[PDB]
């Protein structure tokens, strides 16, 4: 009793000191003296949970709740543990019980909201966050998580005040040395200073440091030359996204394109094999592939990386799902660089470089980054579109004047099919005249038919790819049939300008929708094409649009589509209107591969500048706006000056091939050049510095 209380206190004392193992030892001694000590079980469980020992933490939570049936806090913390163990149902049960025990327990309502949010149930997440905030008005975690929910569904009620409060909260948390409630991956969405955004990231970087310092591992010995590696630079790519994920859709060809005479590629997967061709390709083409998901201990995994003799370790996650930045905090490699996956600074001292470019990250704003800048010569962005979607390299149209984006055909065997037809016109875009063949295609689409056969060739309805070849739909395989894509498939007007944006709706803000409204108003024959991403955002966009004076028929929504259909249907738009708050990144590459011009207005953050970097590499400077007025003028020009539209569309169509934008071999070779710059700098005994020339 009294002795046990003292022991629990000393363990808490030792807990604050940082001596975690002594804390555990003292907690156990308390339990030895007084076994039925709920507080001691709860404290030990929390400590074990922090150490990552989740199963052991669970044991003690179960003890605590039995001894004290009104211990709502224990139920809540046990829920947090189950959530981390990926037992979502169990976590929800614990949060639900905590709320039943204590209806006024604000933290439990917030924790329940987060399960709903992570489960994609936004309206329910919002409801629970609002309850938390009613109980506890001063609740940074709940306020900021609520703000992101509202961002996801484009709820902009009291937006300006909301942003001010968010900045105020972060300013206060940073001042009081606490972990900011705004996630660094979201920090580009709010009007925070660059200083604040880097500071948020730095706080998370310090979390990793605090986790690894308890391992008490010494600094690793790093290689001083390439002698032990036969003159080859050993590059390790670390990612939780080797599989079906945008990251692999961008870079899956890169490991196999490395020059084996000078480079030895190690891919370290943080995720298990998801069975997709994306994972197959990387495992087959990398020199070495290591599944670190089978090695939970960051100490043992870092040891493995160091054993491999990695010279440059590449962080492809930053603060994204599946990341294990503790690996980088342990510094198993002499040079560690951020690349591609994370659109922002790590803020961490254990990351030496960020791989970017002059357009994305001009030297003037180097203070936005904790890392030194390492410039690729054109853009740091890349996409695997030339390999994944080669059927979109060429197109033909059906003329039912002549439009290039009303009824479109694509296929590996498209030329042969066209050769089977009479009266095919060439303008180089092949045009099929309105004949018996053309009526058969329209009939298929209207009847919702999956496919037909013409002259022995397979003609597929573009809306039905999952029923024909699911691997083709996901981008795992190149389609083997000829596909038809039409405006009628999506309810798009045959006689008007189509402006599109295929991003998640969270990237839109009031200023952006107003810009788009001004454009639509200036171009009578035009619609805006958006996605139900998520659907619950649709009525919010429509309401704001109506408030801006746009009837419902000016905005057209489509469901999110399988990967191939998403890229393919971009051919139906005239122009893409990029989101200035946070650009399309993967989605920018997606739209350009379809030959669709994209209007962008680069900001200051990395995430707001990626589209302009893409277009600069592409060779279309005329699509980059310096202000909102210019963005509007460019968009309206493209939608009203039809000869100019044709010119620009023709430019994008040609340049996606002739420019370096989608050239993965050239990209790999430039990446290799940059790697060697980094190494010879280190090899000369120098600390990291900007590589901007």
């Amino acid at each position: 009793p009294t002795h046990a209380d003292s022991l629990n206190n000393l363990a808490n004392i030792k807990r604050e000191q940082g001596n975690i193992e002594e804390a555990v030892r003292l907690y156990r001694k308390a339990l030895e003296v007084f076994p039925e000590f709920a507080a001691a079980h709860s404290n030990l469980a929390s400590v074990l949970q922090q150490q990552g020992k989740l199963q052991e933490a669970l044991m003690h939570y179960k003890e605590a709740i039995r001894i004290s049936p009104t211990f709502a806090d224990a139920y809540s913390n046990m829920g947090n543990t189950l959530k981390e163990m990926q037992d979502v149902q169990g976590a929800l049960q614990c949060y639900t019980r905590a709320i039943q025990i204590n209806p006024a327990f604000a933290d439990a309502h917030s924790n329940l909201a987060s399960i709903h949010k992570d489960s994609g149930n936004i309206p329910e997440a919002i409801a629970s966050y609002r309850t938390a905030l009613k109980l506890k008005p001063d609740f940074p975690d709940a306020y900021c998580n609520l703000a992101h929910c509202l961002q996801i569904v484009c709820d902009w009620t009291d937006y300006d005040e909301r942003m001010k409060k968010l900045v105020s909260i972060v300013a206060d948390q940073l001042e009081k040395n606490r972990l900011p409630s705004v996630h660094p991956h979201h920090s580009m969405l709010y009007p925070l200073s660059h200083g604040f955004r880097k500071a948020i990231a730095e706080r998370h970087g310090n979390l990793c440091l605090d986790k690894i310092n308890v391992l008490h591992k010494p600094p690793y010995e790093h290689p001083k030359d390439l002698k032990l590696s036969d003159g080859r630079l050993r590059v390790g790519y670390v990612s939780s996204d080797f599989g079906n994920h945008p990251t692999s859709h961008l870079m899956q060809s890169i490991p196999g394109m490395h020059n084996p005479d000078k480079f030895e590629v190690f891919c370290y997967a943080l995720s298990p094999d998801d069975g997709t061709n994306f994972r197959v390709k990387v495992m087959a083409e990398a020199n070495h592939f290591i599944d670190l998901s089978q090695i939970p201990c960051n100490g043992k995994a870092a040891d493995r990386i160091h054993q491999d003799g990695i010279h440059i370790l590449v962080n492809m996650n930053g603060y994204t799902k599946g990341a294990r930045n503790e690996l980088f905090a342990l510094r198993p490699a002499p040079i560690q660089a951020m690349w591609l996956g994370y659109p922002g600074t790590s803020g961490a001292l254990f990351m030496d470089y960020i791989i970017t470019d002059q357009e994305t990250s001009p030297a003037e704003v180097a203070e936005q980054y904790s890392e030194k800048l390492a410039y690729m010569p054109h853009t740091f962005f890349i996409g695997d579109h030339a390999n994944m979607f080669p059927h979109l390299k060429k197109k033909a149209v059906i003329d039912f004047h002549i439009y290039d984006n009303r009824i479109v055909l694509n296929g590996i065997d498209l030329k042969a099919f066209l050769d089977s037809l009479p009266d095919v016109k060439i303008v180089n875009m092949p045009v099929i005249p309105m004949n018996t063949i053309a009526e058969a295609v329209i009939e298929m689409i209207n009847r919702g038919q999956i496919q037909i056969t013409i002259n022995g060739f397979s003609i597929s309805n573009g809306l039905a790819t999952t029923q024909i070849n699911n691997k083709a739909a996901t981008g795992e395989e190149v389609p083997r049939t000829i596909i038809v894509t039409t405006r009628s498939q999506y309810g798009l007007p045959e006689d008007a300008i189509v402006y599109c944006n295929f991003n998640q709706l969270y990237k839109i803000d009031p200023s952006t929708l107003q810009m788009w409204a001004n454009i639509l108003k200036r171009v009578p024959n035009s619609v805006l094409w958006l996605l139900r991403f998520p659907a619950v955002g649709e009525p919010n966009i429509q309401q704001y649009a109506q408030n801006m004076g746009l009837p419902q028929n000016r905005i057209i929504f489509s469901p999110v589509a399988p990967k191939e259909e998403h890229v393919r249907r971009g051919q139906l738009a005239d122009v893409c209107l990029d989101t200035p708050l946070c650009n399309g990144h993967t989605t920018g590459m997606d739209v350009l591969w379809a030959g669709t011009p994209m209007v962008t207005m680069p900001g200051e953050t990395l995430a707001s500048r990626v589209a302009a970097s893409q277009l600069t590499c592409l060779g279309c400077l005329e699509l980059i706006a310096k202000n909102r007025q210019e963005y509007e003028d460019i968009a309206v020009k493209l939608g009203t000056d039809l000869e100019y539209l044709k010119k620009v569309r023709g430019k994008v169509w040609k340049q996606r091939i002739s420019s370096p934008l989608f050239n993965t071999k050239q990209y790999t070779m430039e990446l290799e050049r940059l790697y060697l710059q980094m190494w010879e700098h280190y090899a000369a005994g120098n600390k990291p510095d900007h590589m901007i020339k």
Binding site: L179, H183, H204, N244, P246, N317, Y319, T320, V560, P562
Partner: peptide, 14 residues
Amino acid sequence: YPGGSTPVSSANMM
């Protein structure tokens, strides 16, 4: 996409 999955960039847990 409805009926399947569309992976996206996701923030890690904190």
